[PDB]
Amino acid sequence: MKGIIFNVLEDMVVAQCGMSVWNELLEKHAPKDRVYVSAKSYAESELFSIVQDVAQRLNMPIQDVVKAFGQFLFNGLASRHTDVVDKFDDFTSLVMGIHDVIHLEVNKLYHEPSLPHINGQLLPNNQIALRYSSPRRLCFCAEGLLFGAAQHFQQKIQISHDTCMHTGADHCMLIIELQND
Numbered sequence: 001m002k003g004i005i006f007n008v009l010e011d012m013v014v015a016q017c018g019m020s021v022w023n024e025l026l027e028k029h030a031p032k033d034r035v036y037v038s039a040k041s042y043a044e045s046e047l048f049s050i051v052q053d054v055a056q057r058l059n060m061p062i063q064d065v066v067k068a069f070g071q072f073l074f075n076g077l078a079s080r081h082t083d084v085v086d087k088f089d090d091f092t093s094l095v096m097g098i099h100d101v102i103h104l105e106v107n108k109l110y111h112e113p114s115l116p117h118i119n120g121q122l123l124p125n126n127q128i129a130l131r132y133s134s135p136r137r138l139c140f141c142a143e144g145l146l147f148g149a150a151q152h153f154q155q156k157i158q159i160s161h162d163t164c165m166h167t168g169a170d171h172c173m174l175i176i177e178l179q180n181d
């Protein structure tokens, strides 16, 4: 009933340094309200400030922290939306269903028509072309999410990101190759 994203995160930090670290940097970087709502979208920037700081104390690079954060975010989320996710029965069905159902249901349940831009297209040889674009330029997170869902189903995959809005590009290009080993 309070910030779904922050809820799954609190579980991650608690596993790294404990709840004291989460409450410490949270109270320092928290606003006047001092509350994280999942239905709202305000004070959402605090997540970024928390990801870079938590990385400092945890002694980790922000690029790795944001990634790991995603992998786990998917795990916890699935447990809350197992109904929506389970509609894929397999990593292949989800990647292409991301924007589609997964982001269409959360919109009605929370937030409002303004979710990142994701276009999954199926290719041959068991490959999937996933396009990503959004000012948040938090693509680094999208990668982690893809790996989190893959592992959850003992499914190994590889992602090639040559196009990144972070490199002046207007969008991004993430190709997820599926292993048939």
Ligand code: HEM
Pocket: 041, 044, 074, 077, 078, 081, 084, 085, 098, 102, 103, 106, 111, 115, 116, 118, 134, 136, 137, 138, 139, 141, 142, 145, 146, 149
């Ligand atoms: C691997 C699968 C997924 C991908 C690649 C994906 C990707 C993204 C990305 C990267 C964001 C973070 C904002 C940003 O783009 O910078 C986003 C936002 C969001 N996604 Fe997903 N998503 C996935 C699965 C899901 C699932 C399963 C749900 C439902 C539980 C979901 C719920 C959300 C929510 C709630 C937001 C909005 C965050 C906000 O604006 O406060 N997504 N998604």
